[PDB]
Structure formats: C-alpha cells, structure tokens
Design a protein around this motif. Structure first.
Motif, PDB file in Angstrom:
ATOM      1  N   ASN A  39     -74.467  46.359 -47.626  1.00  0.00           N
ATOM      2  CA  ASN A  39     -75.936  47.066 -47.642  1.00  0.00           C
ATOM      3  C   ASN A  39     -75.700  48.390 -48.119  1.00  0.00           C
ATOM      4  OD1 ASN A  39     -74.321  47.586 -45.534  1.00  0.00           O
ATOM      5  ND2 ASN A  39     -75.695  47.185 -44.056  1.00  0.00           N
ATOM      6  N   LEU A  52     -75.701  46.664 -52.297  1.00  0.00           N
ATOM      7  CA  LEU A  52     -75.224  45.084 -52.513  1.00  0.00           C
ATOM      8  C   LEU A  52     -76.622  44.376 -52.111  1.00  0.00           C
ATOM      9  CD1 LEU A  52     -74.128  42.868 -53.742  1.00  0.00           C
ATOM     10  CD2 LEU A  52     -72.445  42.714 -51.818  1.00  0.00           C
ATOM     11  N   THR A  53     -77.405  43.922 -53.119  1.00  0.00           N
ATOM     12  CA  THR A  53     -78.769  43.285 -52.772  1.00  0.00           C
ATOM     13  C   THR A  53     -78.262  42.107 -51.990  1.00  0.00           C
ATOM     14  OG1 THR A  53     -80.523  42.218 -53.914  1.00  0.00           O
ATOM     15  CG2 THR A  53     -78.591  41.903 -55.107  1.00  0.00           C
ATOM     16  N   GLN A  54     -77.418  41.235 -52.324  1.00  0.00           N
ATOM     17  CA  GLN A  54     -76.659  39.977 -51.549  1.00  0.00           C
ATOM     18  C   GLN A  54     -75.555  39.818 -51.299  1.00  0.00           C
ATOM     19  OE1 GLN A  54     -76.142  35.342 -52.897  1.00  0.00           O
ATOM     20  NE2 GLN A  54     -77.833  36.422 -53.763  1.00  0.00           N
ATOM     21  N   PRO A  55     -74.917  40.180 -50.168  1.00  0.00           N
ATOM     22  CA  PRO A  55     -73.497  40.135 -49.696  1.00  0.00           C
ATOM     23  C   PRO A  55     -72.942  38.810 -50.003  1.00  0.00           C
ATOM     24  CG  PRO A  55     -74.907  41.395 -47.930  1.00  0.00           C
ATOM     25  CD  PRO A  55     -75.881  40.638 -48.834  1.00  0.00           C
ATOM     26  N   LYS A  56     -73.655  37.703 -49.955  1.00  0.00           N
ATOM     27  CA  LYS A  56     -73.293  36.501 -50.122  1.00  0.00           C
ATOM     28  C   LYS A  56     -72.912  36.633 -51.687  1.00  0.00           C
ATOM     29  CE  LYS A  56     -77.208  34.520 -49.888  1.00  0.00           C
ATOM     30  NZ  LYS A  56     -78.191  33.335 -49.797  1.00  0.00           N
ATOM     31  N   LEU A  57     -73.213  37.094 -52.648  1.00  0.00           N
ATOM     32  CA  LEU A  57     -72.656  37.491 -53.900  1.00  0.00           C
ATOM     33  C   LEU A  57     -71.253  37.791 -53.940  1.00  0.00           C
ATOM     34  CD1 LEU A  57     -75.825  39.025 -55.621  1.00  0.00           C
ATOM     35  CD2 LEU A  57     -74.901  36.756 -55.835  1.00  0.00           C
ATOM     36  N   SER A  58     -70.612  38.307 -53.064  1.00  0.00           N
ATOM     37  CA  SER A  58     -69.462  38.962 -52.755  1.00  0.00           C
ATOM     38  C   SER A  58     -68.112  37.928 -53.183  1.00  0.00           C
ATOM     39  CB  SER A  58     -69.119  39.679 -51.436  1.00  0.00           C
ATOM     40  OG  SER A  58     -69.147  38.526 -50.627  1.00  0.00           O
ATOM     41  N   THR A  59     -68.469  36.759 -53.293  1.00  0.00           N
ATOM     42  CA  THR A  59     -67.502  35.781 -53.408  1.00  0.00           C
ATOM     43  C   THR A  59     -66.790  35.910 -54.862  1.00  0.00           C
ATOM     44  OG1 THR A  59     -68.946  34.362 -54.276  1.00  0.00           O
ATOM     45  CG2 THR A  59     -68.638  34.075 -51.918  1.00  0.00           C
ATOM     46  N   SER A  81     -69.162  40.842 -59.816  1.00  0.00           N
ATOM     47  CA  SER A  81     -70.232  40.547 -60.826  1.00  0.00           C
ATOM     48  C   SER A  81     -70.890  42.046 -61.233  1.00  0.00           C
ATOM     49  CB  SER A  81     -71.563  40.294 -59.786  1.00  0.00           C
ATOM     50  OG  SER A  81     -72.029  41.600 -59.279  1.00  0.00           O
ATOM     51  N   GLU A 139     -72.461  44.587 -59.298  1.00  0.00           N
ATOM     52  CA  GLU A 139     -71.387  45.206 -58.356  1.00  0.00           C
ATOM     53  C   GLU A 139     -70.791  46.498 -59.218  1.00  0.00           C
ATOM     54  OE1 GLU A 139     -68.412  42.651 -57.054  1.00  0.00           O
ATOM     55  OE2 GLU A 139     -68.099  43.760 -55.189  1.00  0.00           O
TER      56      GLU A 139
END
Lengths: 332, 332, 97, 49, 49, 49
Positions: free
Chosen positions: B179, B183-190, B193, B196
């Motif tokens: 945050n 990072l707009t969506q931490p879920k994306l961290s997988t 991107s 990022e």
C-alpha cells in the motif's frame, strides 16, 4: 516615459493596460475575474505568484485595509515595491527580507510601513539606519557563507519540522538498557571491609553527591581545574573522615563510575548525530543541560512507545539536533 | 553443477545444522517434550527445521518467536521460555546462513538480501530446504521440475535486482507495505508486473535525488499512513506536519503541497504513497520550469472541456503573467 | 549565455547502536567453577581469534572489489579518447585538401 | 594503451589470490564461527550457574 | 568522467566494511575496555597489599 | 591486548574518513572543468559565424 508607467505598462501582455485607480479587489483569491486580472497584472511585477500571497496580507495589515482586500493605489504599490526592491538591491530574495526584518525587529512587514521620523526616536524607527543594518549584516552573512533560513532556524526565529519516531524510541530504551547494565552504581559497591567506617553510599546520597538510582550528580567545571580535584574538594567539604586512603579510593570509585556513565551517553549521541564524544558533554551544557539530569529523566521515564515519550525529552532531542547543526556548520 | 549444488546443500544441511530431538533433552527442559510439542504446533519440522515466519515492518524475529511461544502457552517460566527461544533463533540463523551464502556464491548476490529476495520470489527458506531434503536429486535427470523452475525464477530475479540499484530496506518495505508502495492491488504480487516496475522506477528516482536520507522517507510514510489507523481512519490534523515535512524533503512550499492534496481531493490531504509523491514531484517539476501556480496548472488540466470563456481567460492571463515572470526570472 | 552548476549535496548518515539483552539461568553442572573457568576462557579466546581473523578477510575482499571496479571504470575513457584522436586525423585530411 | 589496460585487468583477475578465494574461505569460517558461538556460550552459561 | 567519479564514491560507500562498522565496534569495545580496567585494577591493588 | 586492538580500529577509521573526504573534495573541480569546456564550444560557434 514616466517611471511608474514604465514599471507596469512596461509592455502590453494583456488586453487592458494596467491602470491606477480607486477601488479594491479580493486579493486573497480574486476568483472574481476582474479582481484576478488586476492581481495578476500586479504580480507582473517580476515576482512569483506564490510570493505575492506572502506579501499581500502584510501589506493590507500595515496599511490597515480590510483583510481580504487591496486597492489600486500608490500606497499599496509603493509598499509592495519597497518590499520587493530593497532586499533585491542586496540580491536577497524578497522572501529572505522578511526573515532579516524579523531578526532585526521581530517584524516581517516592517518595510510595508511608511517612513517615519518620530521624535520618540528609537532603533526600531529609522528606516535609514535599518537599511544600513540590512546592508552590513548581508555582507557579514555572505562573508561567513551562511544562509538566512539556516540562521533563523538556529536563532530560533522559526522551528524546524520534526516528529516522534520509532528509532528515537529504540534509542531511548537502548540507553536505558545499557545504563541498567552494570554502569548504574549500587550500594554494595561501597560494601568493602576497607570502607567499614561509614555507610558511604547513604551518606553520599544524602549529601548531593549521589543519586540513589546509581548516578553521580552533575559538577559544573571551571577553567583552572579538573574533575578529580573538585571531587576531592567535595569530599573534603563533607569532611566525613581524614583518612586520605579511604578518601582516595572513594574518589577513584566515583571518577570511574562517572566516566563510564558519561562515556555511554557520549558515544550514543555521537553515533546518532555524527559528533565527537570529546565534545558531547560540553555541548550538552551549552544546550543548558547535563548528563546527570538527562540520565535521571531517562530512568524516570523509559518510554516504551512513540506515544509514551515525554515532551521534555522530545524537545531535548530537537534542541540537540539544532546545536549539532550549528556546531557542525561552524568549525568549533 | 546444479546437481552438485543441491547435493552439497543437502550434505551440509545434514551436517549438524539440522535440529534433533535430543537438542531439547536437558534437565533444565524436563518439564515437557518440547521437541514433539513444538513439532505438533507449527513451530518445528521433525526433519529438524524451523517453520517459516513472515516478517513485519515494526518487529523482529525473537519478538515474534517469543509471541509464538506465548501463544502456545506451554508454561509461564520465562527462563525455559528464554532458552527455548535462544535455541530456535540460533538454529534458524545457521540454517538460513548456510542457504544464503550458498545462493550468494552461485549468483553473486548478498547474503544480506537472499532471504528477502526469496520471499519476493514468493518462496521461503523453510519450504526450500524441506523440498531439498525431500528430494536430494542424485542425477541431472533426478531433479524435480519444481526446483528447476525455482532456480530459473531465481536467476531471473537476480538479474533484475542486479540491474536495478536495489537494497535490503527497500525490498523489506516492498515485502511489507505494498500500500505504501502504491501497489494498487497487493494480490497482484504473485508475479512481476509492469506497473510494479514503473513504481520501482519512480521510487528509485525519488530516492536518488531527495534532500535527505531515506529513513526520513520511511518515517514520513509510516507517519502519514499509520496515523489514519492508530486512531481509526483519522488524524487528518497531521496534514500540516505531513505537508511541511515532505516540503522539506522535496525543498518546496507546504502551501502548494496542501493545495495540491486538496485539489486531489484526498481525505486527509496527505501524500500516502509513492503514486502521490511522483505526481506531486512532477507538479513541482512543471512549477519550477514555468513559475505557474499549481492551482492554475491543475485547473488547466480541465481546460480541454471547452467549458467557458472566463475560465480560458483566467488561464491564459495567468500563463501570460507567469511567462513574463519566468522571462523576468531568466533574462533579468 | 552560460550559468554555473550547483555543487552536489552531501550528508551525514545516522548509525544505530541500541542493544537488547535477555536473562538466562541453568542447572548446576558436573564440574567445579575453576575447571569450568579454565575451559570457558580457552573457548572464549578461540572464538575471539576467529572473529578477528574473519574480519580481516572481509577487509581484503572489499579492497579487491574496489580496485576491480576502479579499473573497469577507468577502461571506458579510452572510448572518447579514440573518438577524438581519429577525428583529428580526419581534420588533418581536410587541411591537406 | 587501452589494450594494455584491458589485458592488465585480466591478468589481475587471474591472480591466484582472488575474490573467489576470500569468498569461499569466508563462507566456511562463517559457518564455523556461528556454531562455535552457540557451543561455547552454553558452557559459559553453565559456568555462571 | 565526473559521473564515474561520483558513482565510484557511492560504490565505495556501499562497501560492506564501513565507517559505520568501525564506529559501532569501537563503541562496544570502549565500554568493555573501561570496565575491564576498573575490574582488573582492583585485583592488582589487592595483589600489592 | 584490548587496548592495542581498539587502537588499530581507530587507525582504520581515520584512514577511511580521509579517503572519503578527499574523494568528495576532488569531485568539485568538475564544475570548473565543465564551465570552461562549454565555453570553448561557444567560442567555436562564434568563429564559425
């Protein structure tokens, strides 16, 4: 061309030429298109728009106009022109001028005022003397490679922005921990057969030698003398016994204890601020504080959280930072 | 060589560093079968490994190990608890050191960052070593594709983190306050991107040229964001402190900062994350390239709407005045 | 027109030195205090020697890494050097013409 | 001159005493040192008791 | 050239062995050394007696 | 042994501090260097004219 008109209608950049008129405008925001137009044309006087808003309230206040309004008259004009041009003659920003003026008079808007020759002549009144002072000090400042903002901050004319931090919490608690570790004096330290003659620990804490928490009391130094000499003197003053031997070992104990306590604090401060351990104690007294009092407060408070910190110590670190900047800037 | 690498790891891991039940077999520990209990709870792998422990911004390993033990609550004895924690800490540290240095040797990366990097790859030491002992491939054909892909991904990350001028504290932050990193969506961290990457771009950019050390930035971020939580969703009043502090960091005016946040419409008006900082910083870039008021700039962003005459007038007049002031503050 | 270039900013860096500590106790061992003292002091000395030894190795390493970096870094200037030298050759050709 | 510089870099890299050596050594000693710390510390605790 | 120099300064600063390290070490050892002095000195006094 | 050990550390420190200071100090000359080089460019422009 007239000096005035040259200054403003220096060239046509808009539809209307600027004109000097009766009436007012809401300079604070001037959302009214015409008011904005007027203010913008006035901002055409070289300076940045943002700068304008620093100046205008002061001008309004000094001239006595309504807070939100300014008028299209020479008075406003001349006041502004003074405030702009005068520091500029010394290459100082009009922004800076405010700083120097406050430094000299604790007033920013001083040049907004009209000149005066009050029979109640006082240093704060002669425009001319004040100008001459601005001249002199500007020279001195550049000579010393200083900066008005820095100076004002150091002189306490304006506060530096600071806030509590996790690391400062860690710092304090670290100090407290190490201080608790062995370096804090204890009554048993006196419990030796050689010292059987008296309860030195209590006695020395009833006299203003020792804090029962395990700290030596502060001792203001003097030009011609040194610590052990004055500790000797203190002990002689209480006069518990004539035995030089016990006296000697007592002094030894006190010296080494103090030296450990002060070393700990000194190195810690040094590590945080980038200053020599050699100067930390003196600097602290110049800040108007001492090791003993500092450590006393520390053990008295030991804040565990950022909210827990006592403002007293927060201001201590603030002041400390300030002094560190000063003593690092100067070749002290 | 990768085969040799894996088997080397397994060998050294088998050598002493893998924990064993007898390690707990001491008279001091007679109170319970700690080893079994700690392996029934999710503390220990009976193979002799500590389980993974996700770190957090404000805390450290022993603190959370302490917490874990307190959570199982086997006994109140601080002493046994303490030694248990000691054991666990040192065991973990050996295990992780071994792996870290090995990876470092293969890929040319610091041991200091290997653990964090691994979590950023989305894996952990415990799981890695578990898989290692679970497989110990003896031949090039024996390798499990899982680990083959692990090394592939690892190589990729190593290239990235070597190309960019990355550091431990940065990646720790990345692993902890997405945050704050905007990072707009931490879920994306997988997976990695482009957003990022771009964020990382402007982050490093800001870092390499800000006024003062990055810990001040850390402090600013945590101050600004956590205040909206430490008092639930509140502390808007800190906007002034936030603004002025950031203004010092950026060398700018808190007035402009506040106004910008207000035009953004953020409540509280505080730059909570790198996205905000980058926008603000861009805005300053334009301001210092044009002398134009940030208010007018942001307003001008709407001018494309072909809305109305007076708006266009005000903008053009402002830009013209600002131009004259810019040429003033350039030619003369 | 020409303007000077501002000198790059430099700053101090804070260094943390706080430390924690934990209490410990253990049951009475088989051996008397003085044997234990002798054993322990021997071990402690060994450990200290190890630490200092390692330290020196890191100092060595960073020294080499510095020199390597410096050398490769210096290797780039030749690019410009070559460029300008060749350029002068061409200039002399034109003069001859 | 450029050629000499580049070649010199290579020859220097080919010195037997090398970054690699120190790296390897360090990794070994590190593991040993950490274990030794744990070990002797336990005995010292016992000594205090 | 200027750029290389400035970057080199940074890389040098980022050497692991660093001013900070020595500073920290020194502070620790200093405290230990002072305490040791006091301690052993007392025993030596006793020895003379 | 402690005293001598510490001493060596201070010698290290001051060595590093010297080198750091020297490097940053040297970094300033580029200012003038840039100034004069650019100035020569302008001079050549005038000659062309």
């Amino acid at each position: 061309i007239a000096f005035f008109d040259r200054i403003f209608n220096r060239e046509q950049l808009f539809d209307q030429p600027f004109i000097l008129d009766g009436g007012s405008f809401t300079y604070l925001d001037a959302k009214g298109s015409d008011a904005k137009s007027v203010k913008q044309l006035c901002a055409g006087l070289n300076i940045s728009a943002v700068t304008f808003q620093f100046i205008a309230p002061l001008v309004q206040s000094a001239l006595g106009l309504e807070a939100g309004t300014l008028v299209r008259s020479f008075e406003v004009v001349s006041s502004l022109y003074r405030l702009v041009s005068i520091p500029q003659t010394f290459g100082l920003s009009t922004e800076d001028g405010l700083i120097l003026m406050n430094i000299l008079t604790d007033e920013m808007g001083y040049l907004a005022k009209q000149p005066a020759f009050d029979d109640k002549q006082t240093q704060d009144k002669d425009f001319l003397s004040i100008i001459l002072k601005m001249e002199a000090l500007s020279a001195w400042l550049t000579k010393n490679n200083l900066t008005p903002a820095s100076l004002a901050l150091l002189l306490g004319v304006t506060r530096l922005a600071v806030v509590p931090t996790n690391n400062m919490v860690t710092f304090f608690k670290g100090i407290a921990n190490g201080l608790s570790e062995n370096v804090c004096l204890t009554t048993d330290d006196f419990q030796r057969q050689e010292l059987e003659g008296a309860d030195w620990w209590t006695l020395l804490s009833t006299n203003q030698v020792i804090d029962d928490m395990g700290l030596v009391l502060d001792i203001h130094p003097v030009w011609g003398k040194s610590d052990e000499e004055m500790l000797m003197e203190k002990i002689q003053s209480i006069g518990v016994s004539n035995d030089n031997n016990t006296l000697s070992i007592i002094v030894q104990i006190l010296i080494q204890a103090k030296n450990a306590q002060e070393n700990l604090l000194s190195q810690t401060i040094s590590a945080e601020y980038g200053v020599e351990r050699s100067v930390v104690p003196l600097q602290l007294r110049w800040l108007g504080s001492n090791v003993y009092s500092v450590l006393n407060q520390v053990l008295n408070n030991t804040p565990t959280d950022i909210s827990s910190i006592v403002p007293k110590l927060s201001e201590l670190t603030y002041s400390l930072l300030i002094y560190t900047q000063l003593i690092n800037s100067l070749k002290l | 060589n990768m085969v040799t690498f894996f088997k080397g790891i397994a060998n050294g891991l088998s050598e002493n560093v893998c924990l064993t039940t007898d390690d707990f077999q001491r008279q001091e520990l007679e109170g319970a079968d700690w080893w079994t209990l700690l392996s029934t709870n999710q503390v220990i792998d009976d193979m002799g490994l500590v389980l993974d422990i996700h770190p957090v911004w404000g805390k450290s390993d022993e603190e959370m190990l302490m917490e874990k033990i307190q959570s199982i609550g086997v006994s109140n004895d601080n002493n046994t608890l303490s030694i248990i924690v000691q054991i666990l800490i040192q065991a973990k540290n050996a295990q992780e050191n071994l792996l870290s240095q090995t990876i470092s040797a293969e890929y040319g990366v610091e041991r200091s960052v290997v653990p964090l990097q691994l979590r950023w790859l989305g894996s952990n030491v415990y799981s890695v070593l578990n898989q290692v002992l679970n497989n110990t491939p003896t031949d090039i054909s024996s390798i499990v594709p899982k680990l083959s892909e692990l090394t592939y991904s690892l190589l990729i990350y190593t290239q990235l983190i070597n190309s960019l001028k990355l550091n431990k504290e940065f990646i720790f932050l990345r692993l902890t306050q997405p945050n704050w990193l905007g990072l707009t969506q931490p879920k994306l961290s997988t997976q990695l991107s482009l957003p990022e990457i771009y964020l990382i771009t402007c982050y490093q950019d800001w870092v390499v040229n800000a006024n003062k050390n990055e810990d001040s930035i850390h402090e600013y971020l945590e101050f600004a964001n956590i205040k909206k939580t430490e008092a639930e969703k509140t502390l808007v009043d800190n906007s002034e402190k936030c603004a002025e502090l950031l203004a010092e960091i950026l060398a700018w005016d808190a007035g402009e900062i506040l106004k910008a946040a207000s035009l953004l419409g953020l409540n509280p008006p505080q730059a909570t994350n790198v996205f905000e900082i980058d926008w603000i910083r861009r805005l300053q870039t334009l301001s210092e390239k044009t002398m134009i008021s940030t208010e007018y700039l942001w307003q001008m962003g709407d001018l494309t709407e072909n809305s109305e005459f007076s708006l266009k007038e005000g903008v053009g007049e402002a830009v013209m005045a600002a131009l004259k002031a810019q040429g003033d503050s350039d030619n003369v | 027109s020409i303007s000077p270039r501002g000198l790059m900013k430099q700053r101090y860096q804070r260094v943390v030195t706080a430390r924690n500590a934990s209490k410990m106790n253990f049951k009475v061992p088989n051996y008397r205090f003085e044997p234990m003292l002798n054993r322990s002091k021997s071990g402690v000395e060994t450990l200290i020697q190890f630490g200092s030894t390692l330290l020196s190795l890191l100092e060595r390493k960073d020294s080499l890494s510095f020199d390597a970096y410096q050398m490769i870094q210096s290797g780039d200037l030749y690019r410009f050097s070559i460029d300008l030298q060749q350029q002068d050759i061409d200039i002399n050709k034109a003069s001859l013409e | 001159q450029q050629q000499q510089a580049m070649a010199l870099l290579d020859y220097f890299s080919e010195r037997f005493t090398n970054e690699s050596l120190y790296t390897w050594l360090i990794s070994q000693l590190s593991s040993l040192y950490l274990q030794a710390y744990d070990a002797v510390l336990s005995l010292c605790l016992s000594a205090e008791a």
